Structures are given as C-alpha cells and as structure tokens.
Design a protein around this ligand. Sequence first.
Ligand SMILES: CCCCCCC/C=C\CCCCCC(=O)OC[C@@H](O)CO
Ligand SMILES: CCCCCCC/C=C\CCCCCC(=O)OC[C@@H](O)CO
Ligand SMILES: CCCCCCC/C=C\CCCCCC(=O)OC[C@@H](O)CO
Ligand SMILES: CCCCCCC/C=C\CCCCCC(=O)OC[C@@H](O)CO
Ligand SMILES: CCCCCCC/C=C\CCCCCC(=O)OC[C@@H](O)CO
Ligand SMILES: CCCCCCC/C=C\CCCCCC(=O)OC[C@@H](O)CO
Ligand SMILES: CCCCCCC/C=C\CCCCCC(=O)OC[C@@H](O)CO
Ligand SMILES: CCCCCCC/C=C\CCCCCC(=O)OC[C@@H](O)CO
Ligand SMILES: CCCCCCC/C=C\CCCCCC(=O)OC[C@@H](O)CO
Ligand SMILES: CCCCCCC/C=C\CCCCCC(=O)OC[C@@H](O)CO
Ligand SMILES: CCCCCCC/C=C\CCCCCC(=O)OC[C@@H](O)CO
Ligand SMILES: CCCCCCC/C=C\CCCCCC(=O)OC[C@@H](O)CO
Ligand SMILES: CCCCCCC/C=C\CCCCCC(=O)OC[C@@H](O)CO
Length: 466
Amino acid sequence: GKTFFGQPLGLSTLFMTEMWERFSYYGMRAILLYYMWFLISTGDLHITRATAASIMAIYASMVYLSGTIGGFVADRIIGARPAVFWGGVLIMLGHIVLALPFGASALFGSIILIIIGTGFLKPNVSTLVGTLYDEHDRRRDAGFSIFVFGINLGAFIAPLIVGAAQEAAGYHVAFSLAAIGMFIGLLVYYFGGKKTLDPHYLRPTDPLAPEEVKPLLVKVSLAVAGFIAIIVVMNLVGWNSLPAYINLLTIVAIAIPVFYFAWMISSTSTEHLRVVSYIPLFIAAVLFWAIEEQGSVVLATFAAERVDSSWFPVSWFQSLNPLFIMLYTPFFAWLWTAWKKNQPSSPTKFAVGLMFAGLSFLLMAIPGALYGTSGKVSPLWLVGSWALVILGEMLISPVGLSVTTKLNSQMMSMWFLSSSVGSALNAQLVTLYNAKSEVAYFSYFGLGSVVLGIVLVFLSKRIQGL
Ligand SMILES: CCCCCCC/C=C\CCCCCC(=O)OC[C@@H](O)CO
Ligand SMILES: CCCCCCC/C=C\CCCCCC(=O)OC[C@@H](O)CO
Ligand SMILES: CCCCCCC/C=C\CCCCCC(=O)OC[C@@H](O)CO
Ligand SMILES: CCCCCCC/C=C\CCCCCC(=O)OC[C@@H](O)CO
Ligand SMILES: CCCCCCC/C=C\CCCCCC(=O)OC[C@@H](O)CO
Ligand SMILES: CCCCCCC/C=C\CCCCCC(=O)OC[C@@H](O)CO
Ligand SMILES: CCCCCCC/C=C\CCCCCC(=O)OC[C@@H](O)CO
Ligand SMILES: CCCCCCC/C=C\CCCCCC(=O)OC[C@@H](O)CO
Ligand SMILES: CCCCCCC/C=C\CCCCCC(=O)OC[C@@H](O)CO
Ligand SMILES: CCCCCCC/C=C\CCCCCC(=O)OC[C@@H](O)CO
Ligand SMILES: CCCCCCC/C=C\CCCCCC(=O)OC[C@@H](O)CO
Ligand SMILES: CCCCCCC/C=C\CCCCCC(=O)OC[C@@H](O)CO
Ligand SMILES: CCCCCCC/C=C\CCCCCC(=O)OC[C@@H](O)CO
C-alpha cells in the first residue's frame, strides 16, 4: 500500500534521522577549521594552523574508530534504539557546547561529546534499517540505497545553510544551527520510532550473560589503565604538547589494525593466504580514504586561501563531495548491472579507484605550477578535484565491505577502520601542506598514489584467485 519509495514506512523515520544527524556533522565540519583559524587570529587559541588541520584529521579518525564500537555496546548492553537516542543527545550537546559564548576552551568537550555520540548513533541507525526487513526480502538493497541518499542529502545542504549562517550571524549561531539539526533529528526519531520500530530493539539483542560481565569489566579497565599510564609517562618525560597527544592518537589508530593483522597472520593455511592478500587492498583503502578525508582540511585550506570566492561562503565547497556522490550513484548503479560480461574484479576496482584519487591531487598541482602560488585561481580546479576523487569512491566503497567479507568479525571491522587509519595518516601529512609546499605536496602524494594504484593492478590477478 502506502510505502516510502517502495519500502516500509519506517524507513522514512530513519532516513530523516540520519539526514539531520549528518546535517549536524557536516555543517560543523564545514566551518570548524575556519573557526579554529579565527580563534588563532584573535590569540584565543595558541596553536599553529598546521596543528588546527591536524586536529581536524585526528578528529575524523576518532569518529570512525568510535563507530566500530557502538554496535557492540548497543547489541550487548543498551539496545539499538537507546543508542541512537542518547548518541543523538550527545551529538546535540557537542554542538550546543560550541554555541555557548565560550571559545577555545570548549573545543575539547565538544569533540569528545561528538566522538562518543556519533559512535553510538552511526552504526546503530544502520542496524535499525536492516531490522525493517525480513531477511529474505529483496527490497533490502534498495532501502539502504535510499537511506544512503538521505545521508548524502544532509551532507549536501549542511554546508550551504550552516556556512551562510556563519557569514550572516557568526560562528556561535552557525553552530547552534547544527545543534538544531540534530534536535530535529531526535524529534523525528523519537516519535516516528515509537510508531514504526520493533520494541525488541529497545533492549540489547545479545545481552551479557552473568559470567560475561566480569571479564568485560576487566578488559575495559586494563585498556583504560594502560592508556592513562601511557599519558602519565608521556608527561613525565615532557611529551605533553598537543602535537604529542595527536601523535599518540595516531599511533593507537594505526596499531589497532596492525595488531589485528599480526594476530591473524600468526594464528587454514589457504585461509591464511587470503588474509595476506588483503593487506594490499587494505593499504589501498587507507590511502584512498586519506586523500578523500583531506577534502575537509587541505582542500578547505586551498578553497579559503587560493580560490577567488569573494562572492560566496568558501565553506560551500564542502558540498561538492556529497553532490558528486549523489550525481554519480544512480549512474554506477545502472553501470554494474549493464556491465555483466567482463566486470572488473573488486581488487581491480580498488586499484583504479586509488588512481583516480591520485589524479585528483595531481590535478591540483597544476594551477600552482602554471600560475604560481601567490595569486588566486578558478573555483573549477576544486570542482574537478572532487569530481575525480568521488569517481574514485564509486569504485572502492560499494565493493569495499564486500571484498573484505568474502576474504572474521575483526576483519569486518577492519574495512570500517581503513577510514580511521587514513585520517590518522592525514593527521601527520596535512601539517606538511602550506603555500610554499603546495605544488610538491599535491604532486608527490598524487603521483605516489597513482603508482601504488599501478602496483595493485599488477597484483590484481593473484588476489582474484584467492
Ligand atoms: C575508542 C573510542 C574513541 C577513543 C578516542 C579518544 C578521544 C580522545 C581525544 C579526542 C581527540 C581530541 C584531539 C583534538 C584536541 O585536542 O583539541 C583540543 C584543543 O583545541 C585544546 O587546545
Ligand atoms: C531533547 C530530545 C528531544 C526528543 C523528544 C523528547 C523525548 C522525551 C523524553 C526524553 C527523556 C527520555 C527519552 C526516551 C529514551 O530514553 O529513548 C527513546 C528511544 O530509546 C527510542 O524510543
Ligand atoms: C533542547 C535543546 C536543543 C536546542 C538547540 C540549542 C541551540 C539554540 C540556540 C542557541 C543560541 C546561541 C547563539 C547566541 C549567541 O551567543 O550569538 C553570538 C553572538 O553574540 C555573536 O553574533
Ligand atoms: C569493545 C567493547 C567496549 C564496551 C564498553 C562497555 C562498558 C564497560 C563495562 C560495562 C559493563 C556493563 C554491564 C551490563 C549489565 O548490566 O549486564 C548485566 C547482566 O546482563 C548480567 O546478567
Ligand atoms: C593497541 C594499542 C597500542 C598502542 C601502542 C602504545 C603507544 C606507545 C607510545 C606512544 C608514544 C607517545 C606519542 C609520541 C610522542 O609523544 O611524540 C611527540 C613528541 O615527541 C613531540 O613533543
Ligand atoms: C550546484 C551545487 C551547488 C553547491 C555546490 C558547491 C558550490 C561551491 C562552489 C562552486 C563554484 C564554482 C562555479 C564556477 C564559477 O563560478 O565560474 C568561475 C567564476 O569565478 C567566474 O566568475
Ligand atoms: C567527459 C570526461 C571529461 C574528462 C576530462 C579529462 C581532464 C582533462 C584535462 C584536465 C587538465 C586540466 C586542464 C588544464 C587547464 O585547463 O589549464 C589552463 C586553464 O587555466 C585555462 O587557461
Ligand atoms: C584524467 C583527468 C586528468 C588528470 C590530471 C593529471 C595531471 C597530470 C600531471 C600534473 C602534475 C603537475 C606537476 C607540475 C610540477 O610538478 O611542477 C613543479 C615545478 O616545476 C613547478 O612548481
Ligand atoms: C598514460 C599516457 C600518458 C602519456 C604521458 C602523459 C604525461 C602527462 C603529464 C606529464 C607531467 C608534466 C611535466 C611535469 C612538469 O611540468 O614539471 C617538470 C619539469 O618542469 C622539471 O621539474
Ligand atoms: C592528461 C591530460 C591533461 C594534461 C595534464 C598535463 C599537465 C602537466 C603539467 C602542466 C604544468 C605546466 C607548467 C609547469 C611548468 O613548466 O612550470 C615549471 C617551470 O616550467 C616554470 O618555471
Ligand atoms: C567518467 C567521466 C567523469 C567526468 C569527470 C569530468 C571532470 C574530471 C576532471 C576535470 C578536471 C578539470 C579541471 C581543471 C579546469 O577545469 O580548469 C579550471 C579553469 O581554468 C577553468 O576556467
Ligand atoms: C604505504 C602506506 C603509507 C604511505 C605514507 C607514508 C608517509 C609518506 C611520506 C612522508 C613524508 C612526505 C614527503 C614530503 C612531502 O611530500 O611534503 C611536501 C614537501 O615539499 C614538504 O616537506
Ligand atoms: C607515459 C608512460 C607510461 C605509459 C602508459 C601506459 C602504461 C600501461 C600499462 C603499463 C604496463 C602494465 C602491464 C599490464 C599488466 O600486466 O597488468 C594488467 C593486469 O590486468 C594483468 O597483469
């Protein structure tokens, strides 16, 4: 009868829920870097612009890492529906914290709230989408495709609205708009959810058995103690600068997949050989996400310093990324179906995807080389870059989780960890970007990325077999 684009009505609630949460997230991202610059310019915030960029990168990295944990907490301890709700409350608080007349002092509280909040909400709204379908219901793919379109929608309009607001009424009003975005999300989620969602997901679906509670408690406490202990030693030997902490978070984010790789490989020999073949794919994913995650940092810097954008808010460039996702998506949907005969392998898609990413940086090296780096250049250079990298994303992401799974639960999380690892790498790399290094930065990381894409093409055939 009455459906939401063919799908159960309950999909409309989750569609809107995520649309507004993503609105709140990307509205904030579009101006947070400029906000840190602002706070630097007034002497309120005592860091370099390069450190500000580094913060942006490690922030994303922690958001993605947080998300690989929220599923477990909801499944085992609090339930999917409460996770989404309190996750949204924490996200809203994080934005409210930035709307207050405080300054640089609120930055950390804001960041922690949103890292925890997002990590609760984000995997669990996906989970709730799945629960709308019987599991042999073929509509499922369509429904997720629709859900994703809502995600891209929020990411698309947020910089336009929040950025304009920032221009009209300043940073605190613009951040309050992100808060209101999340609030709307919660409103629709709460009341819409009660009508359409199974009450079963009010509770955990795999609750802790009595003998499971102690070891989990022991597990968590040790990790905290260690982490605290590392921070203590760090300060005793004088490694207590913001860059040092960012470095520590970088190490933790890299170590997690490195430890997992070291585990599987050490610990079925043919099962082993498939795991070793994934390492090239994982590296490729990491490098790809790095370049893509620099849209909000390095391309954002470029947009503000090198582009003549005197007639519109420079944060609007952050809308090109989800615009191109939305434009490309129904195309590539049609493409794979039409292309039945000799479809490229998922490892081949990874390689070519990395090349396009690499091309997107190589493109950006041209205006500096041709025109110099002291003037301003056309907005279209950036438009071409995002067009190139998102073309890369269409090849890598839709097959990404697929390639990892067919090659367990730790490996499954490893795909979602590639975007965290890429951002952690960025936290180091983006500090190398400035006006003097511009052309070398784009060239080097552009070319290297294309080369590794070439290497992966050579390696593609053996991985296909496995
Ligand atoms: C395991 C789940 C996630 C674990 C991540 C732990 C979160 C810890 C720190 C979050 C990153 C904050 C770094 C940025 C920062 O320090 O900004 C504050 C700075 O402006 C103060 O001057
Ligand atoms: C400030 C958030 C606006 C949302 C509308 C207000 C919600 C009503 C009461 C708030 C306190 C309890 C919230 C309900 C809750 O804990 O979880 C609801 C969620 O689990 C799905 O029904
Ligand atoms: C249930 C609570 C969720 C509602 C969202 C809360 C955010 C709404 C309004 C906050 C207004 C903050 C902006 C006021 C402000 O300080 O403007 C700064 C101004 O002096 C500079 O132009
Ligand atoms: C990757 C794992 C991270 C998860 C962090 C979870 C927080 C750590 C400890 C909280 C223990 C929760 C106790 C849950 C509970 O009340 O269940 C007890 C009951 O089910 C026993 O019959
Ligand atoms: C499963 C997680 C494993 C994590 C491994 C533990 C990390 C051990 C040591 C981290 C070193 C501290 C971070 C580096 C650092 O502070 O250097 C920056 C400093 O030199 C600048 O002042
Ligand atoms: C169509 C989607 C709207 C939102 C997308 C993000 C828009 C941000 C930047 C786009 C500006 C590029 C437009 C090309 C252009 O303005 O021509 C060059 C111009 O400088 C000549 O005056
Ligand atoms: C339908 C697919 C279109 C694919 C287009 C492939 C990309 C071709 C060329 C990209 C290189 C940038 C062009 C160099 C350039 O325009 O610089 C000069 C410019 O400033 C105008 O004088
Ligand atoms: C298919 C779409 C087109 C892809 C565009 C790829 C552009 C290819 C190469 C761009 C690299 C330009 C590097 C210029 C350069 O390194 O000059 C350095 C120095 O001589 C000037 O600073
Ligand atoms: C795959 C088929 C393509 C055939 C070759 C295409 C090569 C396209 C561009 C090459 C890079 C341009 C030259 C780099 C440059 O301008 O600076 C280098 C030179 O100034 C010394 O640093
Ligand atoms: C692949 C199709 C598009 C072709 C893209 C090739 C563009 C590669 C390099 C273009 C940069 C031209 C200017 C670089 C340059 O010569 O500056 C260095 C030196 O000559 C100036 O002092
Ligand atoms: C499969 C086909 C994908 C279509 C993508 C087409 C666009 C991809 C690359 C084009 C990059 C060119 C951007 C450089 C440029 O346009 O010059 C800017 C400026 O000179 C215009 O005034
Ligand atoms: C294989 C997976 C990890 C690959 C990335 C590892 C890090 C790679 C290079 C780090 C050094 C960057 C080289 C210097 C650079 O390109 O910056 C531009 C330069 O002009 C400013 O120093
Ligand atoms: C301008 C300088 C670069 C020349 C451009 C042309 C390069 C094209 C291919 C390079 C050699 C790749 C060999 C093909 C190959 O073995 O990989 C294909 C893969 O399907 C099976 O191995």
